[PDB]
Design a protein around this ligand. Structure first.
Ligand SMILES: Nc1ncnc2c1ncn2[C@@H]1O[C@H](CSCC[C@H](N)C(=O)O)[C@@H](O)[C@H]1O
Ligand SMILES: C[n+]1cccc(C(N)=O)c1
Length: 261
């Protein structure tokens, strides 16, 4: 049935994932086009609006940092987290500037271009490394997703391409949303990106399930979780044939309501 979290542990190859989706090279052209659009939207979200603060927690980061490049302009501290241990190790290779770490330069350069070339690649990378304070295990399915570690409430919760993969059905998706809210202060921002109407994605021969949700369904689930949707955009691009069956992606910004009861 739907991919279990133990299948992630035993099947998810971080370096392979990065090469296939985030190399930003001459192949995987559909994946490149989506990446371009994601970077554009994340730039708008984090640089052009009021999504700023002290602490941002990224949920289901996997081995990627593309989703944090504009964010580090607006947040002093970033916590990254994922369920899959090997993803966390891959991330650490890059954070620690190790030989054989994934080459993020073409992505970094693109983001720097988007932001008006106020800094160069090396400076942007240093800024993000400094911003990333913790690399933690997380499980979105749990009432306490970070295992109940003592952390201040976040000003922003970010999650990219995670919830659809981690939730077998809409009731589970609703639960994951509730679980995430436990980490966010009232007035805080929820920034989410995910595939639309996708029931699977591939990493080579390895297949991983996805919950196919249309944009209206995502809207309704987020609103019913209490969030005022401040921004919502659809990315009309599709992943490569046989790589996924998605029809576009979305990005959104929600604000958690003030405390009442
Ligand atoms: N129950 C769960 N809790 C937290 N993360 C989970 C999870 N189940 C799967 N994941 C993670 O969801 C990720 C999907 S791949 C997404 C990676 C990255 N955020 C990007 O934008 O490309 C994987 O890293 C996987 O480890
Ligand atoms: C590229 N990618 C990564 C994670 C999830 C998906 C999807 N839910 O279809 C796609």
């Amino acid at each position: 049935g739907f991919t279990s979290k133990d299948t992630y542990l035993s099947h998810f190859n971080p370096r392979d994932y990065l090469e296939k989706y985030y190399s930003f090279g001459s192949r995987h052209c559909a994946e490149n086009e989506i990446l371009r659009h994601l970077l554009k939207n994340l730039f708008k979200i984090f640089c052009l609006g009021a999504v700023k603060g002290e602490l941002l927690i990224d949920i289901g980061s996997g081995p990627t940092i593309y989703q944090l490049l504009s964010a580090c302009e607006s947040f002093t501290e970033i916590i990254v987290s994922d369920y899959t241990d090997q993803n966390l190790w891959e991330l650490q290779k890059w954070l620690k500037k190790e030989p054989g770490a994934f080459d993020w330069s073409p992505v970094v350069t693109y983001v720097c271009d988007l932001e008006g070339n106020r800094m160069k690649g090396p400076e942007k990378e240093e800024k993000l490394r400094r911003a990333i304070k913790q690399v933690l295990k997380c499980d979105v399915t749990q009432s306490q997703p970070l295992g109940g570690v003592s952390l201040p409430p976040a000003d922003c919760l970010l999650s990219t391409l995670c919830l659809d993969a981690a939730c077998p059905d809409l009731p589970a998706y609703r639960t994951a949303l509730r679980n995430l809210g436990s980490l966010l202060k009232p007035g805080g921002f929820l920034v989410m990106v995910d595939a639309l109407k996708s029931s699977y994605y591939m990493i080579g021969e390895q297949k991983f399930s996805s919950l196919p949700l249309g944009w209206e369904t995502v809207r309704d689930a987020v609103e019913e979780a209490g969030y005022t949707i401040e921004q919502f955009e659809v990315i009309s691009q599709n992943y490569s044939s046989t790589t996924s069956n998605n029809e576009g992606l979305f990005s959104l910004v929600g604000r958690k309501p003030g405390r009442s009861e």
